[PDB]
Design a protein around this ligand. Structure first.
Ligand SMILES: CNC(=O)[C@H](C)N1Cc2ccc(Cl)cc2[C@H](C(=O)Nc2cncc3ccccc23)C1
Ligand SMILES: CNC(=O)[C@H](C)N1Cc2ccc(Cl)cc2[C@H](C(=O)Nc2cncc3ccccc23)C1
Ligand SMILES: [Cl-]
Lengths: 301, 297
């Protein structure tokens, strides 16, 4: 029993964190096999950030301009290349602590663990979700760039995020491990803003099923809804549309609890209308949207 | 910017988790130096049950390797299995007993394999609101101080309300609980006042100031009000501990207490603080300073 926001154990990722320095800029890098991955903006000055020509800035650098530190050991950079917004530094030592890994690009609504780092040293681990507007609500200070997001389903680490910047609203923007940004963002200090955010509907439904599994049914009702009528109501509360894919994905939880997906959709419509009336669901007075259907099945009985 | 419930990096603890089997029971053990620590319920008159066991009855598995048990002893509610091999991954460590209101990270494990890490607090009623299923017994709670792991909790059981009970690493239970199947219940819980105040300071640091007011209060008047809402009493020690946060934000501790008093009597009025519609009490003053300064391990 119990339901917590739970992160994956971070040990396999801690053994990959290194410090990357280029001139006056210091940030974090991810050391896997004989390559260190880090944000390309490590080659920029604060001035270069408005309209940087990364190709022009990189061609002026040599291997010995990049200082890479793994614990108390200095690694030797023997090559460098840029792939999208990520810099790949070839080093002369393969990481003996390299776990089994994959690079995965995730979709909005997916969750992952973040190992927040400063100066190549891990400081904390937290769980978060890729928002529908492609930002993440992280907890990051200056020097956290290069910190990574990951999932460890089974024994393999799937790297899905690398931190690059903080937008003016305090939310964060980054890339996959191939350097492609999530969202319409660029690694430039030009005027950029997160779009209006919405609630991840399929995740709220998954979390209502987690509450039923743990014993709570106060929010259920005798009603059902069509998918179209639910979406017409949901859109008015800034909730993401629920697709047939989402309904199919909630199938196993529906079968376990005996509550059809459209019946749970009717319960969500009522909660949006009534609020909680002084009650809580799994210790929360708000509807939680940072647990996926897969997270609920993994954590719950 | 941002404020998350954050756990310590778990790597130093993952390298200590092993599986302990005795008969039909399988649970988790903590392998430090040449000793494996686990709940004594893996084997009631525990001395009479233990005397009937031999070293070979305890099967200890570290990854895919079987460890050899060469001795066994009991210390309070913890079983200590002496093994032939010292853990090469043993970090610098201490065993510490924590107080209610203090927070720690839990590395939830099943079959000696870590599955998740979460942050939690020792409630004033000595239970923890964890997330545990069958097989989780032996999972540990910890904090990190520079490079030293301070082990403070070992999981033993789940109470009928879904909350959890356990011991320090010396086998002494937190709370009036016993390791046996008998009627036990968590006592009435209270809110950790000093932690709610620390969390209000974190919200201010992050630009959430709607709840601030021009008012102040005496410590006595605040405690009279706090006692009415099932909040723990705030002591002068707590006020002193919130000193640095008070100096950084410019809001005196008793000034923040007047905000807390208005929040208890009037509510949030449809608003949120750090994305929460409830007053959060599982961040200590030290947690707030650490997360709003980026201390590394
Ligand atoms: C808020 N940002 C800033 O004040 C400065 C000037 N930033 C500009 C900028 C523009 C583009 C890119 Cl790709 C990176 C960056 C940097 C950036 O975003 N770094 C940070 C990341 N995460 C969290 C932070 C928290 C505080 C301060 C920097 C944080 C610097
Ligand atoms: C809820 N408990 C049970 O069903 C059984 C009969 N328990 C009795 C008992 C009595 C004393 C001690 Cl010290 C331990 C234990 C066991 C216990 O509590 N283990 C569990 C721990 N955490 C989480 C759990 C979740 C589910 C089921 C067991 C969980 C088993
Ligand atoms: Cl995905």
């Amino acid at each position: 029993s119990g339901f917590r926001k739970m992160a994956f154990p971070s040990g396999k990722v801690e053994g990959c964190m290194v410090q990357v320095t280029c001139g006056t800029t210091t940030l974090n890098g991810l050391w896997l096999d004989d390559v260190v991955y880090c944000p390309r903006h490590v080659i920029c000055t604060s001035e270069d950030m408005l309209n940087p020509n990364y190709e022009d800035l990189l061609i002026r650098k040599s291997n010995h301009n990049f200082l890479v530190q793994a614990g108390n050991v200095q690694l030797r950079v023997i090559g460098h290349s840029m792939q999208n917004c990520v810099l790949k530094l070839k080093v002369d030592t393969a990481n003996p602590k390299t776990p089994k890994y994959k690079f995965v690009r995730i979709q909005p609504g997916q969750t992952f663990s973040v190992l927040a780092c400063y100066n190549g040293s891990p400081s904390g681990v937290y769980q978060c979700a890729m928002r529908p507007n492609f930002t993440i609500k992280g907890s990051f200070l200056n020097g956290s760039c290069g910190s990574v997001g990951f999932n460890i389903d089974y024994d393999c680490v799937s790297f899905c995020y690398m931190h690059h910047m903080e937008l003016p609203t305090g939310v964060h923007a980054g890339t996959d491990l191939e350097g492609n940004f999530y969202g319409p963002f660029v690694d430039r200090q030009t005027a950029q803003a997160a779009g209006t955010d919405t609630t991840i509907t399929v995740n709220v439904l998954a979390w209502l099923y987690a509450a039923v599994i743990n014993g709570d049914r106060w929010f259920l009702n005798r009603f059902t809804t069509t998918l179209n009528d639910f979406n017409l109501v949901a859109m008015k509360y800034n909730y993401e549309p629920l697709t047939q894919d989402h309904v199919d994905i909630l199938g196993p939880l529906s079968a376990q609890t005996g509550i059809a997906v459209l019946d749970m959709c009717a319960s969500l419509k009522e909660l949006l209308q009534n609020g909680m009336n002084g009650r809580t669901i799994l210790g929360s007075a708000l509807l939680e949207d940072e647990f996926t259907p897969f997270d609920v099945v993994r954590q719950c009985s």
